[PDB]
Design a protein around this nucleic acid. Sequence first.
DNA 1: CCGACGTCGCATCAGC
DNA 2: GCTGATGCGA
DNA 3: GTCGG
Length: 326
Amino acid sequence: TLNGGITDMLTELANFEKNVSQAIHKYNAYRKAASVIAKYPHKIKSGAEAKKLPGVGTKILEKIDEFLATGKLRKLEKIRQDDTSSSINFLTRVSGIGPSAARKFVDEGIKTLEDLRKNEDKLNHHQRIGLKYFGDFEKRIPREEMLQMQDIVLNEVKKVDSEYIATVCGSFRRGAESSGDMDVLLTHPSFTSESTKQPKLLHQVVEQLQKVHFITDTLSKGETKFMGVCQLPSKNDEKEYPHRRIDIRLIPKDQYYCGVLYFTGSDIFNKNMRAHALEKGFTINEYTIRPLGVTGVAGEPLPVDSEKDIFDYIQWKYREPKDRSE
DNA sequence: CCGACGTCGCATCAGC
DNA sequence: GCTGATGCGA
DNA sequence: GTCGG
Ligand SMILES: Nc1ccn([C@H]2C[C@H](O)[C@@H](COP(=O)(O)OP(=O)(O)[C@H](Cl)P(=O)(O)O)O2)c(=O)n1
Ligand SMILES: Nc1ccn([C@H]2C[C@H](O)[C@@H](COP(=O)(O)O)O2)c(=O)n1
Ligand SMILES: [Cl-]
Ligand SMILES: [Mg+2]
Ligand SMILES: [Mg+2]
Ligand code: NA
Ligand code: NA
Ligand code: NA
């Protein structure tokens, strides 16, 4: 794209601040700046031009000037050369290893892929599966594969109970030609904001997907959120498909629109929209939009009958899913 | 200047 | 066991 | 790191 060099630089800085510095707000600031520059429809000529965008300030403007003049950023060149930062950044690429566990592993001399495989007994379950599928989980999913996966999930869910509705969200719902994983929103009329009239609603679906060998591993699992591993079936003599991350979120059926707004994302779009809600005097989660009293405490849920109702409350024009890929 | 920055599910741990 | 952080993830 | 009161 037009400003790929700048946005990659800001993303690398974002990852440093999260993984090494453990500075969650600097991480989000860099990602917000990279996102707003990514959708800017001109090739940026100067830091000053970029600083006009919301989320770009004086410091990123200076870095943009350095990068435009030299093609690189000295601050990043040094980070790339630091072994502890290098080790930490690698270890956090394993699902289940975060900034804290990464730094503890390096303290103990566990810093490479051979180190990890040599010490499986020092990994919790999630980390163990992330290491197992380390290569697969960095591969992207062609939309064609997402379509075959959607068909399995939708048909298997239908076999459990035809009253389930499963909706693939994430980047797939935003129309992306490839996705990092599969996100499935799930509803069933027995689970509403007012009652749960049937247990094991999420479990039953997971069990059925395991029994047809679509779901292969479990990272975490509770009553409303499954986080796991899935894999398409391959034909005779075919090489196997890579294993894929899958997330399944069971949402109260009457709160579907807030739930599908949340799970469609992107993450940055949700942050921006929820931040706008707060400025407008509302708070949004995956269940409800509520007003804020002068108090500061959230009031009662407002009526929502479409995704667009949520946008209307905060005085945003509606944005189709394909336009939320911030 | 400086407080706020989105919001929450599940796993793990510490204190009682 | 419970409860309230903290980690890591969506 | 950036924003807004
Ligand atoms: N920090 C986050 C992460 C995710 N989310 C929401 C929004 C996101 O679209 C949805 C699924 O999480 P993913 O990490 O899979 O994001 P996607 O938008 O699907 C990525 Cl573009 P992907 O295609 O690489 O998976 O969960 C969020 O609200 N906050
Ligand atoms: N997973 C889903 C998807 C849609 N729905 C409901 C919400 C609306 O009444 C309707 C939306 O239909 P559609 O968005 O496919 O046009 O179906 C649901 O209850 N659970
Ligand atoms: Cl709520
Ligand atoms: Mg996804
Ligand atoms: Mg603010
Ligand atoms: Na700006
Ligand atoms: Na990780
Ligand atoms: Na996901």
